Amino acid sequence: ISPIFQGGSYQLNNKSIDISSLLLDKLSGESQTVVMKFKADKPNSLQALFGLSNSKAGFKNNYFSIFMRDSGEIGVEIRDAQKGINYLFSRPASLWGKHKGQAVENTLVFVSDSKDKTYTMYVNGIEVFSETVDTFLPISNINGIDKATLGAVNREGKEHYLAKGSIDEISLFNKAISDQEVSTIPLSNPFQLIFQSGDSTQANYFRIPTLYTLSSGRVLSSIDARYGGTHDSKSKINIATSYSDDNGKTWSEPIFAMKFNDYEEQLVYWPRDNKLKNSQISGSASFIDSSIVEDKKSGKTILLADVMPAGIGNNNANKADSGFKEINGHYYLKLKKNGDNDFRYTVRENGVVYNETTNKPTNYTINDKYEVLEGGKSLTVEQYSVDFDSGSLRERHNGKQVPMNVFYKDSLFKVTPTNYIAMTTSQNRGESWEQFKLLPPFLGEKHNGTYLCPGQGLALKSSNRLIFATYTSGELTYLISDDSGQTWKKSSASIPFKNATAEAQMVELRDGVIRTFFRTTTGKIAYMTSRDSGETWSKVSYIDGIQQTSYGTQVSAIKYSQLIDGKEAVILSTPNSRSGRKGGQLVVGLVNKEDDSIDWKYHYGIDLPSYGYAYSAITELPNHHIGVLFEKYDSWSRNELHLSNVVQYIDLEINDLT
Ligand SMILES: O=S(=O)(O)[C@]1(CNC2CCCCC2)C[C@@H](O)[C@@H](O)C1
Numbered sequence: 305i306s307p308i309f310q311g312g313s314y315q316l317n318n319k320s321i322d323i324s325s326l327l328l329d330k331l332s333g334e335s336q337t338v339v340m341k342f343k344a345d346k347p348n349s350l351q352a353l354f355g356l357s358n359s360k361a362g363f364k365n366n367y368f369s370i371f372m373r374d375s376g377e378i379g380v381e382i383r384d385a386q387k388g389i390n391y392l393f394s395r396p397a398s399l400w401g402k403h404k405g406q407a408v409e410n411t412l413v414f415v416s417d418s419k420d421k422t423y424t425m426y427v428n429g430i431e432v433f434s435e436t437v438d439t440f441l442p443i444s445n446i447n448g449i450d451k452a453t454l455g456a457v458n459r460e461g462k463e464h465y466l467a468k469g470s471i472d473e474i475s476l477f478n479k480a481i482s483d484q485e486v487s488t489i490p491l492s493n494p495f496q497l498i499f500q501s502g503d504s505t506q507a508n509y510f511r512i513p514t515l516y517t518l519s520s521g522r523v524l525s526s527i528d529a530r531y532g533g534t535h536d537s538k539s540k541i542n543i544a545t546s547y548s549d550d551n552g553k554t555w556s557e558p559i560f561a562m563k564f565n566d567y568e569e570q571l572v573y574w575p576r577d578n579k580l581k582n583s584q585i586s587g588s589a590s591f592i593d594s595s596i597v598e599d600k601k602s603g604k605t606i607l608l609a610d611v612m613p614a615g616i617g618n619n620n621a622n623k624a625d626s627g628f629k630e631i632n633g634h635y636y637l638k639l640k641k642n643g644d645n646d647f648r649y650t651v652r653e654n655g656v657v658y659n660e661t662t663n664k665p666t667n668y669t670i671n672d673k674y675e676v677l678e679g680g681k682s683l684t685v686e687q688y689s690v691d692f693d694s695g696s697l698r699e700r701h702n703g704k705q706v707p708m709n710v711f712y713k714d715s716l717f718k719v720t721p722t723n724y725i726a727m728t729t730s731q732n733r734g735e736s737w738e739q740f741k742l743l744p745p746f747l748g749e750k751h752n753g754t755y756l757c758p759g760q761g762l763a764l765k766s767s768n769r770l771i772f773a774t775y776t777s778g779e780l781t782y783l784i785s786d787d788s789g790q791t792w793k794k795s796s797a798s799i800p801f802k803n804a805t806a807e808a809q810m811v812e813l814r815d816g817v818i819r820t821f822f823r824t825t826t827g828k829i830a831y832m833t834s835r836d837s838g839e840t841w842s843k844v845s846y847i848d849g850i851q852q853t854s855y856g857t858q859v860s861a862i863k864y865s866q867l868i869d870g871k872e873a874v875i876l877s878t879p880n881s882r883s884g885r886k887g888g889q890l891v892v893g894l895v896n897k898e899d900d901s902i903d904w905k906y907h908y909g910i911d912l913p914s915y916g917y918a919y920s921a922i923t924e925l926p927n928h929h930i931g932v933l934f935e936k937y938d939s940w941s942r943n944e945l946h947l948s949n950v951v952q953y954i955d956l957e958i959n960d961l962t
Pocket of ligand 1: 515516517518760763862863865922923924925926927928
């Protein structure tokens, strides 16, 4: 239908604009849609974009508002003191502020639907909340409404929540337009989505983006497809991938690089309230933290990720057990059979399950997919699904049979409840992935696996050497292959922290010379250097001019292919903030050839200092643009859990950064 009111080019300069005479008598019926295109690149801490209120003395709590915070949160209040109603619905990290240093036009759509008693908010094509209520309050049914205001709410005759920004366009409709109609509203987004709710992964959440540019010109991305909210393992998480063959303009429908099937892939709206938000899928196996490299010699693409058995994450993984048994210089995966309280079995050659107590082979084998066979016959288990129908998280069998896998809760034979690293390869640049294989233990029998550093591995330019950084207590542990990923050895580099999440990414400064940038516990990004292709490593130094929080955040890093100001250049991506995971920047450093020192010369603001920016991936696209896929929210904050469609992709040119 047609708008009952439409207006535009409203400048909000800490002075409200009264539109009462234009709008109030046009409002009718119980359902309404507001469509607002607006900018706010210097917002106040809390500000109202749009207000309908009773402005009379004695009725300060009778109003409807669409408000935003300088954190990027968007929300509404719907209040009527006579009815005893005070609704407040919002979602953090819903907005853009600036892109390439210019204010972004956000497109907000708020649907107030009396028929389903639901209030739904979209920003920039993304649904950020959908809230159904017992007693519906139509936004124009508030007792004694007499003002319609832009850039404030009029309470008792005074301007509250004054806004700084602009409303380029605003329209109101006396109808709750459908989700289908919402999708037809034109957008001006500075970003793209590669992975998103409702896509082929069926995950409602995503974290831990990666990007890597392949020799064909194809750009490949991997990600955690996270089903049980944005929680780290334990949860259900798969690793998914997507690629672009046109310099990031379009992306393929995702497929899985690593997946378990003990739990259903369910798209779930995870609870965000303070009683239930920590609900966590507790009986599922998962993968977490992926990393990609391409091997020039073989042509293979290689992806590693951590693997977690059912119920396991980094917090409860057995730190004192690799899950492997060393027998005459060889490592064998240990297994525990139901009924035993110890690990009496090993997986030997050809997947044969061997009884360590009697030294006899059993009638069981493990196939290449870590599935259990008995006398050659595939065993199955019943799949679980999850729901909150009872008012709390429930995990229960769903009637479907899936292959029995040793990483599963219901398996007859189970692996050690600790963390592992697996690798898969692709021979067609991400169009399909092989079944994963566990990497061997690197730090002996009685040590849990190291933790993969998400992002990119490093292919050295002048050899066949492949390196993936990992971390554990007290060190970075580099995994090195010179044979296309068939075998690996470790190279340990001490760092002066205990129990740091030392997520590390590497650049080759020149032939044989690797610099690694990594997260610390000190508020500063650290680095170390190898001058022998990863065999040995220097002591740790720190980067000045970038601030992180005490807990830190992953940093991504690349060596740019072209000179900048006549110098070789390194680009870092990281939040730059002492408060939270916000204020994302790309930082361009120019290398001094005399000593390999780096002058951090340019700092590019991805968005506002107050807007969220957490884990990130960066890669030089084949056309020398820079692609950035990043978590546009504070992934640490306990207030910003379980947000959909906040991992976002942007395209930048070097001139934008400098
Ligand atoms: O030099 S590589 O390490 O092979 C790599 C790709 N280089 C091309 C060179 C030509 C322009 C695009 C980037 C950089 C890493 O960040 C990965 O994207 C892989």
